[PDB]
Amino acid sequence: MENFQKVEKIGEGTYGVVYKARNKLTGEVVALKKIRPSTAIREISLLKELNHPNIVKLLDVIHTENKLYLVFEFLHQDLKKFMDASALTGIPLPLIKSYLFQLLQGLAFCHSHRVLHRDLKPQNLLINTEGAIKLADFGLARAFGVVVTLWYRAPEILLGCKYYSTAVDIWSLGCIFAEMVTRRALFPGDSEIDQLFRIFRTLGTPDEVVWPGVTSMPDYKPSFPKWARQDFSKVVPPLDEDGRSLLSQMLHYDPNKRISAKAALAHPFFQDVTKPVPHLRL
Ligand SMILES: NC(=O)c1cc([N+](=O)[O-])ccc1NCc1ccc(C(=O)O)cc1
Structure with missing residues (x-):
């Protein structure tokens, strides 16, 4: 060039x-x-x-x-660096909320245009000095496709589903929301099966009751261990009930029950959303 x-x-x-x-x-x-x-x-x-x-x-x-x-x-700067830089004190809740709200607006837009991200992660969420956060690499996975971080992958992708839906992005964003809150990745798997089992250990091994059709997924095995679900109060403390409620809806196993970006924007968690200025050292 x-x-x-x-x-x-x-x-x-x-x-x-x-x-x-x-x-x-x-x-x-x-x-x-x-x-x-x-x-x-x-x-x-x-x-x-x-x-x-x-x-x-x-x-x-x-x-x-x-x-x-x-x-x-x-x-x-990207959100991964910002989170590491904010690790000692944590990103203030108002800023976490502003970022989540803006990311959902971005997803709602892309999804309304039938464009999926498929690989959302802190590294592709970019921020500036004015308090904005933006999604990078939207649409590239599809336009392309074919050590990779699995931490934000939705369970339907891990179980071998070949048709992704907008729900995979909501799942990834819920994982990121949790990480901003706790300052620890939610499901830090180091292999596809470790990723899947870390999800099962926290949210419970899915079954036909909560996820109709799960036992017919390509990579589902009846031999998967059956773990009981844990309480969100133990998962993302000290996040309040508005936040836990929204996160629970972003992490539903069934992609069809998973909340949409549009619906998430209307969740009570955002009733008092604002747009703070982050402390950025460049
Ligand atoms: N659009 C983009 O500015 C950007 C693009 C990419 N990318 O992989 O295409 C990756 C990171 C990006 N910014 C954040 C950034 C900027 C500078 C540095 C650095 O200098 O280390 C790190 C991250």
């Missing part, structure tokens, strides 16, 4: 290396991701039309010299 002036490599992103770069002409500072099919090109291109304040803007999709580059609006 002669048009760009690589300011520095900022990591080995999900689909390849990413650099902070400055457009030599416009002078704009952007994030440039070089990706490792005409089908993908078209899908990816469609995402350039997906604009919302809580979605990281995809500025350009460049297919040149038979290589793929994605140009994104730049944000200085």
